[PDB]
Amino acid sequence: MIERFISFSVIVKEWGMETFIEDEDNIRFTVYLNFVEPEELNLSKFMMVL
Amino acid sequence: EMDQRLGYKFLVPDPKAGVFYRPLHFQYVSYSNFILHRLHEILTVKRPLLSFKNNTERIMIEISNVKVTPPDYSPIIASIKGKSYDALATFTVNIFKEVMTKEGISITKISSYEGKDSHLIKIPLLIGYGNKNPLDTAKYLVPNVIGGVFINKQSVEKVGINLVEKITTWPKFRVVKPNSFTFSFSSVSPPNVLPTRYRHYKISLDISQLEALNISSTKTFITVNIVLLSQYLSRVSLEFIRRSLSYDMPPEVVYLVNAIIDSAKRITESITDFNIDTYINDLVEAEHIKQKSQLTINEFKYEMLHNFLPHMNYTPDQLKGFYMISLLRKFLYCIFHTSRYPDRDSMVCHRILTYGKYFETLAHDELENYIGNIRNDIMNNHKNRGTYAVNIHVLTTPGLNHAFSSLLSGKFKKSDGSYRTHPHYSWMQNISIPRSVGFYPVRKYHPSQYLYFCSSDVPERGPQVGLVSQLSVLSSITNILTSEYLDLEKKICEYIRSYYKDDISYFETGFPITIENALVASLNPNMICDFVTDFRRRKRMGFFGNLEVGITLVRDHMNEIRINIGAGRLVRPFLVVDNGELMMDVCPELESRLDDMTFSDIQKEFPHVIEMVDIEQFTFSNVCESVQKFRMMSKDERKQYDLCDFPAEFRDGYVASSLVGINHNSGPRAILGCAQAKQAISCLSSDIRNKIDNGIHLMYPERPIVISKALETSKIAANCFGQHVTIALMSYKGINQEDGIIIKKQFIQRGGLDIVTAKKHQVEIPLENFNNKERSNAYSKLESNGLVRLNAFLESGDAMARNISSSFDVSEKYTDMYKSRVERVQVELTDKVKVRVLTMKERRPILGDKFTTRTSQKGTVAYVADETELPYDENGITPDVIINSTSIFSRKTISMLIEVILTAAYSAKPYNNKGENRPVCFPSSNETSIDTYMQFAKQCYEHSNPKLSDEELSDKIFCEKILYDPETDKPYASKVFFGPIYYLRLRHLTQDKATVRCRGKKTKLIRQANEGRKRGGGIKFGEMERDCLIAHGAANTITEVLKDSEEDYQDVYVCENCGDIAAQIKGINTCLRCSKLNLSPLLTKIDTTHVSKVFLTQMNARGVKVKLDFERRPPSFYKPLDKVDLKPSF
Amino acid sequence: VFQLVCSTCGKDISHERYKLIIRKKSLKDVLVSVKNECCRLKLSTQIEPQRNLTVQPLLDI
Ligand SMILES: [Zn+2]
Ligand SMILES: [Zn+2]
């Protein structure tokens, strides 16, 4: 779900993903991002719609 | 039980505060405020009308010398004679030009008018308590009169309800579409600004377009980004706005905040060398050019930006900017948590109009129209002629008279229920109607109506379902004058600015303080609680000169402090809880002194026991439901509560207070009981023989003795609505079924539940016809003077006054199937003759008449049994009424049983230990235990007969008896429930509903029976009945039912070529259209209804030609047929 | 204060009514000689309604 949303997004420029097992009962998905211009406006929109 | 005594103390009269009758007090003042004070302020104006040159040549209109006077006759004289009850108001008008000169002021009169001796304005006058008006300070009060009515031009009594204002006090939220929201609000000038100014703003937000977060109106303000507008008004940075908005919000809203702020910054940077003032000025100039305004740019800009927020006029711009910021904050919060923001149907954001406000608004509107018309006339006269002449006949017709007449007729803006003719069903209606509140078309029971409106008193059917509510006995509506408003506001501002000098300038992380939505300060959060507490204490001591000020602390995340002082707010008294402590319990002297003190004395001498709280403040507080539940909590639990409520019996209306123990029954029964309690017949009027009006009156009234306190203080009990009768709960020969009742003949003969119906008749006669000299059979009851005789009985064909048109009688006729006695006759002679007659008739119960109890057990008379045909007890008592017992337990009306028991107890010992008559308190919303009632009844019986066996005492307490069969004198199988109860008679009578027709008139267009019971019309055979008859298979029956009467047949011919009804010329059938074309078509006879011909002709009018053929089947012959058996082979 | 008999059983209650309304004796002393429930309720709860004088003449032109 996460990867599909990020891949086709029109407000993301560069992206990467990874997954970690925090412990026996948690999973951590990490995403590295760089947005298109304007930067902070798109950052706020992304964090709002994620 | 001290709380019950304190509640009682509020319902009794309070002479020290000028309260002589609590139930309607707030209405009287609402009118005394208008007729005495507000009218003078509205009328007394001194305004420019036109200006010339440059503010040195202007015409001025001034109004002064306003006087108001009352009539010279009592309202009873007005009712009898047929006059009207109005007060007369007169004023003087000056129109004069003024020229500004360095020497001072130049005045040149142009016109002046006066109304010293004229009906310049006629204002309807309120009758009020004791038949006493605010203008007349007489010293005689008519007892048993509470007033609350008006008398219109035609001598008709009128009564009205309260209405909810269209302008709310909280902004309205709405989801325009997915991810697209709007937020609309309004601004209005303070009371002391004539004329009042209005503004209506809307904020639009859309997730897809965050650069268009725009505030707008209609042709009165620019469309600008709200963040930049706040920057302009308050002169602060964008980062400041970000920090202010995202201070104490949940993290989900902060993302939206950041997006909005960054969008605003992007707009800012898209313009080279951005400057806020230039931005605003460019927008203003673009708007100016878009419109065709002829003002200079400076005038346009000043007008736009100076009247930005009328309610906050004469304050710096920074406070306006902060007000905008707080509105935006609430907008965002409601976007993300919609269910926690006051809904639009909530009573938290509404206010209510009383009697005075209707008249105030109408006066405002008419004065404005008057001045506008004068200005237009002067402009036209200057345009055509010269010298600026003011035409007469335009400054002598203010137009108030027509407005007030239309108001009393039932027209007020877009509402049509404000006023109506008073239907004289009950004495309690005088209370019920003035205390109603209507809402514009919402039908669900909102939680905010609880405790301030009666829960059970609402319409049960019709178009008004769920749109009319009734105040509780303890609720009221605030009034306030203009001078008092100003003084109170000034005191509040002085207190805020004096006691909190260092901590009212936060503006970034504080709580904005508003007075009537006017931001005046911003408080340090760490001090909010104290500020409220210290405030409320000062409120209760009268420190501000007013005990009804409302203070609300909103804290979810909106973080606001709201103070309300205006008029039109709902307020109730509450018990105070101060620092986890009930003040009522720490005031020992109050219990000893309560007897000799009034409500205001308690407020003055024992503050902090009771606080007057309005609805908005209530909705945000923590309130304990009862004193008993409070006393059962730990101190830590107690520390969380601000108020404590009164017993439940104070949460009902005055109508619902007629019933008993409504909380022991089902709710639908309560609704029905409230609906019918108003239709019971009572002692309607003290002027039974004087007033010429319709009505119904109870003949031998009795005062109920199982009542609540509200029924005693309102005087509903002292005016009676029934009688005490003996009832038995049993089946009688299977006759009393499906709510029918058996009634006793000797009870009816002796006067049981006997009523009198009175009716009013009125006619107008041209003088010649009245004086015309010819004895028709309709003039048997007429005296030599052409008027009906006193005390005579009129029949269904009699006339009341001679009216001959010239040698024909054209007088109106009496049209009731029963007779009536002529009680009073009044005549007025003018160009015409006006005759009014009052007739009366006594109506003992008969089959079909309708009765009920106070628990909604309604039934009609099904049989009139003789005294010797009824079961009797060992004392020889037979019941006056017999009701089937099964319905009592299938409908679950338990309280009824209890009522009977208590009534029986009252009969055994009806006096105190001092020997005084002692009613029994059984309130609606009881709260007392059944066991205690049984113990009271047991004590009563034991006092009565000290020597009773246990079985006898139990039978008496439970109201059980062995009854005997009159025919055989033998007991029945088991004991019966048998005892006295207060019984009511409703106004639905059989002879008022009977109808029959044999032959009569017809409607001209279609030639069918006419309509109207009073006009001898027929009953309508609907098409559902037609479907039913077709379901039986009876074709001939319905065919003959839908056809014209066989006695109205006639020969009609139709042309087979074009379908026209052939005319008959010189006895020859001929189709004119076809004859003109040299044709010889066949004419055939038809048998149809008249309406069919009308319909077809009208269809021919529109251009459609309808042609009919006829069947010419060849002849047929009968032939013998062989036999057939059809039985089986067995 | 108007009817002369009990509407339920038909007994005579005029003497007690005079004793109560005109001599203004205690309700207890009055009821000392009344036994039936209906009669006690009638003597305890019946009133004469409040009314104004009648405007005269009844026929006015
Ligand atoms: Zn024809
Ligand atoms: Zn009796």
Coordinates of C-alpha atoms in Angstrom, one line a residue, chain B residues 512-914:
Chain B
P512 CA -9.6 36.0 23.8
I513 CA -12.3 37.7 25.8
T514 CA -15.4 38.8 23.9
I515 CA -18.4 40.9 25.0
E516 CA -21.2 40.3 22.5
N517 CA -18.6 38.9 20.1
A518 CA -16.4 42.0 20.5
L519 CA -12.8 41.1 21.3
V520 CA -11.5 43.3 24.1
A521 CA -8.6 41.4 25.6
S522 CA -6.6 38.2 25.6
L523 CA -6.0 36.5 28.9
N524 CA -3.0 34.5 30.2
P525 CA -4.0 30.8 30.1
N526 CA -2.6 30.1 33.5
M527 CA -5.3 32.4 34.9
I528 CA -8.4 31.4 33.1
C529 CA -10.1 29.5 35.9
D530 CA -9.6 32.2 38.5
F531 CA -10.9 34.9 36.1
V532 CA -14.1 33.0 35.7
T533 CA -14.6 32.1 39.3
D534 CA -13.8 35.6 40.6
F535 CA -16.1 36.9 37.9
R536 CA -19.1 34.8 38.8
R537 CA -18.9 35.6 42.5
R538 CA -18.9 39.3 41.6
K539 CA -21.9 38.7 39.3
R540 CA -23.9 37.1 42.2
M541 CA -23.3 40.1 44.5
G542 CA -24.7 42.6 41.9
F543 CA -21.2 44.1 41.5
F544 CA -22.1 44.9 37.8
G545 CA -25.7 45.9 38.5
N546 CA -27.2 42.9 36.7
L547 CA -27.6 39.4 37.9
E548 CA -28.3 37.8 34.5
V549 CA -24.9 38.3 32.9
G550 CA -23.7 35.1 31.2
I551 CA -20.1 34.0 31.2
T552 CA -18.9 30.9 29.3
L553 CA -15.5 29.2 29.3
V554 CA -14.9 27.1 26.1
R555 CA -11.9 24.9 26.4
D556 CA -12.0 21.8 24.2
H557 CA -9.4 23.3 22.0
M558 CA -11.2 26.5 20.9
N559 CA -10.1 28.3 24.1
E560 CA -12.5 31.2 24.4
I561 CA -14.1 33.3 27.1
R562 CA -17.6 34.6 26.1
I563 CA -19.7 37.2 28.0
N564 CA -23.3 37.9 27.0
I565 CA -25.5 40.7 28.3
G566 CA -28.0 41.1 25.4
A567 CA -31.7 40.5 25.5
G568 CA -33.5 37.4 24.2
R569 CA -31.6 34.8 26.2
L570 CA -33.0 31.9 28.2
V571 CA -32.1 31.9 31.9
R572 CA -32.8 29.6 34.8
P573 CA -31.9 29.6 38.5
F574 CA -29.4 27.0 39.7
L575 CA -27.9 25.9 43.0
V576 CA -24.3 27.0 43.4
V577 CA -21.3 24.6 44.1
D578 CA -18.2 26.5 45.2
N579 CA -15.0 24.6 45.6
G580 CA -16.6 21.2 46.1
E581 CA -19.2 22.6 48.5
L582 CA -22.9 23.1 48.2
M583 CA -23.7 26.6 49.5
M584 CA -27.3 25.7 50.3
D585 CA -25.9 23.4 53.1
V586 CA -23.6 25.9 54.7
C587 CA -26.2 28.6 55.4
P588 CA -28.0 27.7 58.6
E589 CA -30.0 30.9 58.9
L590 CA -31.8 30.4 55.6
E591 CA -33.9 27.5 56.8
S592 CA -35.3 29.6 59.6
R593 CA -35.7 32.8 57.6
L594 CA -37.1 31.4 54.3
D595 CA -40.7 31.8 55.3
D596 CA -40.7 35.6 55.4
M597 CA -38.5 36.3 52.4
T598 CA -39.1 36.7 48.7
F599 CA -36.9 35.5 45.9
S600 CA -35.1 38.8 45.4
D601 CA -34.6 39.1 49.2
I602 CA -32.8 35.7 49.1
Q603 CA -30.7 36.9 46.2
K604 CA -29.7 40.1 48.1
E605 CA -29.2 38.7 51.6
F606 CA -27.9 35.2 50.7
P607 CA -25.8 35.5 47.6
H608 CA -23.9 32.4 46.4
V609 CA -26.8 30.1 47.0
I610 CA -28.6 30.7 43.7
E611 CA -27.2 31.8 40.3
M612 CA -29.0 32.8 37.2
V613 CA -27.5 30.8 34.3
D614 CA -28.3 31.0 30.6
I615 CA -28.4 28.2 28.2
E616 CA -25.0 28.6 26.5
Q617 CA -23.2 28.8 29.9
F618 CA -25.1 25.7 31.0
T619 CA -24.1 23.6 28.0
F620 CA -20.4 24.0 28.9
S621 CA -20.6 23.5 32.7
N622 CA -20.6 20.4 34.9
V623 CA -24.0 20.1 36.7
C624 CA -25.0 17.5 39.3
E625 CA -28.5 16.2 38.6
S626 CA -29.8 16.4 42.2
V627 CA -29.0 17.3 45.7
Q628 CA -29.4 13.7 46.9
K629 CA -26.9 12.4 44.3
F630 CA -24.5 15.2 45.3
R631 CA -24.5 14.3 48.9
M632 CA -23.5 10.7 48.0
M633 CA -20.2 11.7 46.3
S634 CA -16.7 12.0 47.7
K635 CA -15.2 15.4 48.2
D636 CA -12.8 14.8 45.3
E637 CA -15.7 13.9 43.1
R638 CA -17.6 17.0 44.4
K639 CA -14.8 19.3 43.4
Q640 CA -15.5 18.8 39.7
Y641 CA -19.0 20.3 39.7
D642 CA -20.0 24.0 39.2
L643 CA -23.8 23.8 39.7
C644 CA -26.5 21.5 41.1
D645 CA -30.0 21.2 39.6
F646 CA -33.5 21.5 41.1
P647 CA -36.0 18.6 41.4
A648 CA -37.5 17.3 38.2
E649 CA -41.0 18.8 38.7
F650 CA -39.6 22.2 37.8
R651 CA -38.6 20.9 34.3
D652 CA -42.2 20.8 33.0
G653 CA -44.4 23.5 31.5
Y654 CA -47.6 24.9 33.1
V655 CA -49.7 22.8 30.8
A656 CA -47.9 19.6 31.7
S657 CA -48.3 20.6 35.4
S658 CA -52.0 19.8 35.1
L659 CA -51.2 16.1 34.8
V660 CA -50.1 13.8 37.6
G661 CA -47.1 11.5 37.8
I662 CA -46.3 11.6 34.1
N663 CA -43.0 9.7 34.8
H664 CA -44.9 6.6 35.8
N665 CA -46.5 6.2 32.4
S666 CA -45.4 5.8 28.8
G667 CA -44.2 8.9 27.0
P668 CA -46.8 8.9 24.2
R669 CA -49.5 9.1 26.8
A670 CA -47.8 12.2 28.2
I671 CA -47.8 13.8 24.7
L672 CA -51.5 13.1 24.3
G673 CA -52.3 14.3 27.8
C674 CA -50.7 17.6 27.2
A675 CA -52.5 17.9 23.9
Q676 CA -55.9 17.3 25.5
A677 CA -55.4 19.2 28.7
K678 CA -55.9 22.4 26.8
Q679 CA -59.2 21.3 25.3
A680 CA -60.9 20.7 28.7
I681 CA -63.7 23.0 29.6
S682 CA -63.1 25.5 32.4
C683 CA -64.3 28.7 33.9
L684 CA -63.4 30.6 30.8
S685 CA -64.2 34.2 31.7
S686 CA -65.6 36.4 34.4
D687 CA -67.4 38.4 31.7
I688 CA -69.6 35.5 30.6
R689 CA -72.7 37.7 30.3
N690 CA -70.9 40.8 29.0
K691 CA -68.3 39.8 26.4
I692 CA -69.8 39.0 23.0
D693 CA -67.6 36.2 21.9
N694 CA -67.6 32.4 21.2
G695 CA -66.8 30.2 24.2
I696 CA -67.6 27.2 26.4
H697 CA -68.1 27.5 30.1
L698 CA -68.3 24.9 33.0
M699 CA -71.4 25.3 35.1
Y700 CA -70.7 23.9 38.6
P701 CA -66.9 23.9 38.9
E702 CA -64.8 22.1 41.4
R703 CA -61.2 22.8 42.5
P704 CA -58.8 19.9 42.2
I705 CA -57.1 18.7 45.4
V706 CA -54.4 16.4 44.1
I707 CA -52.1 18.9 42.4
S708 CA -48.6 20.3 42.0
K709 CA -47.4 23.7 43.3
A710 CA -47.2 25.2 39.8
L711 CA -50.9 24.6 39.3
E712 CA -51.5 26.5 42.5
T713 CA -49.3 29.5 41.7
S714 CA -50.4 30.0 38.1
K715 CA -54.1 30.0 39.2
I716 CA -55.0 27.2 36.8
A717 CA -56.4 25.3 39.8
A718 CA -58.5 28.2 41.1
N719 CA -60.3 28.4 37.8
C720 CA -61.3 24.7 37.6
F721 CA -61.3 22.3 34.6
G722 CA -63.5 19.4 35.7
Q723 CA -65.4 17.7 38.6
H724 CA -64.9 14.9 41.1
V725 CA -66.8 11.8 40.0
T726 CA -67.0 8.2 41.3
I727 CA -65.7 5.6 38.9
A728 CA -65.6 1.8 38.9
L729 CA -63.1 -0.2 36.8
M730 CA -65.1 -3.2 35.4
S731 CA -66.8 -4.6 32.4
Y732 CA -70.5 -3.8 32.1
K733 CA -72.5 -6.4 30.1
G734 CA -69.8 -6.2 27.4
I735 CA -71.0 -2.7 26.4
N736 CA -68.2 -0.4 27.4
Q737 CA -65.6 -1.6 24.9
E738 CA -62.9 0.2 22.8
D739 CA -62.9 3.3 25.0
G740 CA -66.7 3.7 25.4
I741 CA -68.1 4.6 28.8
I742 CA -71.3 4.1 30.7
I743 CA -72.7 7.2 32.5
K744 CA -75.5 7.5 35.0
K745 CA -78.8 9.2 34.2
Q746 CA -79.4 10.8 37.6
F747 CA -75.9 12.2 37.6
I748 CA -76.6 14.0 34.3
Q749 CA -80.0 15.2 35.5
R750 CA -78.6 16.7 38.7
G751 CA -76.0 18.8 36.7
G752 CA -73.0 16.5 36.4
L753 CA -70.4 18.0 34.1
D754 CA -72.9 20.4 32.6
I755 CA -71.6 23.1 30.2
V756 CA -72.9 26.1 28.3
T757 CA -71.8 27.0 24.8
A758 CA -72.0 30.6 23.7
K759 CA -71.8 31.9 20.1
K760 CA -71.6 35.2 18.4
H761 CA -73.6 36.2 15.3
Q762 CA -73.0 39.4 13.2
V763 CA -74.7 40.9 10.2
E764 CA -74.5 44.1 8.1
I765 CA -77.7 45.5 6.5
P766 CA -78.2 48.4 4.1
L767 CA -80.3 51.0 5.8
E768 CA -83.2 50.9 3.3
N769 CA -83.6 47.1 3.7
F770 CA -83.6 47.5 7.5
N771 CA -86.3 50.1 7.3
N772 CA -88.2 48.5 4.5
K773 CA -91.9 47.8 5.4
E774 CA -92.9 44.4 4.1
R775 CA -94.8 38.6 7.6
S776 CA -92.6 35.9 6.2
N777 CA -92.3 32.6 8.2
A778 CA -88.7 33.4 9.0
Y779 CA -89.6 36.6 11.0
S780 CA -91.5 34.9 13.9
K781 CA -88.9 35.9 16.5
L782 CA -88.7 39.6 15.5
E783 CA -90.0 42.5 17.5
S784 CA -91.8 45.5 16.1
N785 CA -88.4 47.2 15.7
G786 CA -87.0 44.6 13.3
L787 CA -84.7 43.0 15.9
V788 CA -84.9 39.6 17.5
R789 CA -86.5 39.4 20.9
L790 CA -84.5 38.8 24.1
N791 CA -84.6 35.3 25.6
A792 CA -86.2 33.8 22.6
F793 CA -85.0 30.5 21.1
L794 CA -83.8 30.5 17.4
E795 CA -84.3 27.6 15.1
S796 CA -82.6 26.5 11.9
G797 CA -84.5 28.9 9.6
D798 CA -84.8 32.0 11.6
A799 CA -83.4 35.5 11.0
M800 CA -82.1 38.0 13.5
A801 CA -82.8 41.3 11.8
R802 CA -85.2 42.4 9.1
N803 CA -83.5 42.8 5.7
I804 CA -85.9 43.1 2.7
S805 CA -84.5 43.9 -0.7
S806 CA -86.7 46.1 -3.0
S807 CA -90.5 42.5 -1.8
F808 CA -88.0 39.6 -1.2
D809 CA -86.4 38.3 2.0
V810 CA -82.6 38.1 1.6
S811 CA -81.6 37.9 5.2
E812 CA -79.1 35.4 6.6
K813 CA -80.3 32.4 8.6
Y814 CA -79.5 30.5 11.8
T815 CA -78.1 27.1 10.8
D816 CA -77.5 24.9 13.8
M817 CA -79.4 21.7 14.4
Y818 CA -80.1 22.7 18.0
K819 CA -81.7 25.9 19.4
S820 CA -80.1 28.7 21.3
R821 CA -81.3 31.5 23.6
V822 CA -80.7 35.1 22.6
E823 CA -78.6 36.5 25.5
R824 CA -77.5 39.9 24.2
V825 CA -78.1 42.2 21.2
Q826 CA -76.0 45.2 20.2
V827 CA -76.7 47.5 17.2
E828 CA -74.8 50.3 15.5
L829 CA -76.5 52.7 13.1
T830 CA -74.6 54.4 10.3
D831 CA -74.7 54.5 6.5
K832 CA -75.2 50.8 7.2
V833 CA -76.7 48.9 10.2
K834 CA -74.4 46.5 12.1
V835 CA -76.0 43.9 14.4
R836 CA -74.2 41.6 16.9
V837 CA -75.9 38.9 18.9
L838 CA -74.7 36.6 21.7
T839 CA -76.6 33.3 22.2
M840 CA -76.2 30.6 24.8
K841 CA -77.2 26.9 25.2
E842 CA -76.7 24.4 27.9
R843 CA -75.6 21.0 26.8
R844 CA -76.0 18.0 29.2
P845 CA -74.0 15.0 28.2
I846 CA -75.5 12.7 25.5
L847 CA -74.3 9.8 23.4
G848 CA -71.1 10.6 21.6
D849 CA -69.8 13.3 24.0
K850 CA -66.1 13.1 24.9
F851 CA -64.4 12.9 28.3
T852 CA -61.0 12.0 29.6
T853 CA -58.9 11.7 32.7
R854 CA -55.6 13.5 33.6
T855 CA -53.6 10.4 32.4
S856 CA -54.9 10.5 28.8
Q857 CA -57.7 8.0 29.1
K858 CA -60.2 9.5 26.7
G859 CA -63.6 8.0 25.8
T860 CA -67.0 8.7 24.4
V861 CA -70.4 8.0 26.0
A862 CA -71.7 4.7 24.7
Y863 CA -74.7 4.2 27.0
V864 CA -76.8 6.2 29.5
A865 CA -77.7 3.7 32.3
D866 CA -80.4 4.3 34.9
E867 CA -79.5 4.4 38.5
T868 CA -81.4 1.1 39.1
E869 CA -79.4 -0.7 36.4
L870 CA -75.9 -0.3 38.0
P871 CA -73.9 -2.4 40.6
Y872 CA -73.8 -0.9 44.1
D873 CA -71.8 -1.3 47.2
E874 CA -72.9 -2.1 50.8
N875 CA -73.4 1.7 51.3
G876 CA -75.7 1.9 48.3
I877 CA -73.3 4.0 46.1
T878 CA -73.5 3.4 42.3
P879 CA -70.7 4.7 40.0
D880 CA -71.2 7.8 38.0
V881 CA -68.9 6.5 35.3
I882 CA -67.7 2.9 34.4
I883 CA -64.5 2.4 32.4
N884 CA -63.0 -0.8 31.2
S885 CA -60.0 -1.9 33.3
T886 CA -58.0 -3.7 30.6
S887 CA -56.9 -0.4 28.9
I888 CA -55.4 0.8 32.2
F889 CA -52.9 -2.1 32.1
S890 CA -52.4 -2.5 28.3
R891 CA -51.4 1.2 28.0
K892 CA -49.5 1.3 31.3
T893 CA -51.1 4.3 32.9
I894 CA -50.1 3.4 36.4
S895 CA -50.4 6.9 37.9
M896 CA -54.1 6.9 37.4
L897 CA -54.5 4.2 40.0
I898 CA -52.4 6.1 42.5
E899 CA -54.4 9.3 41.9
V900 CA -57.6 7.5 42.9
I901 CA -56.1 6.2 46.1
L902 CA -54.8 9.6 47.1
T903 CA -58.2 11.2 46.3
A904 CA -59.9 8.7 48.4
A905 CA -57.5 9.4 51.3
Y906 CA -58.3 13.1 50.9
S907 CA -62.0 12.4 51.4
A908 CA -61.4 10.6 54.6
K909 CA -59.3 13.4 56.2
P910 CA -59.3 16.6 54.2
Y911 CA -57.9 18.9 56.8
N912 CA -54.6 19.6 58.6
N913 CA -54.1 19.2 62.3
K914 CA -55.0 22.8 62.5

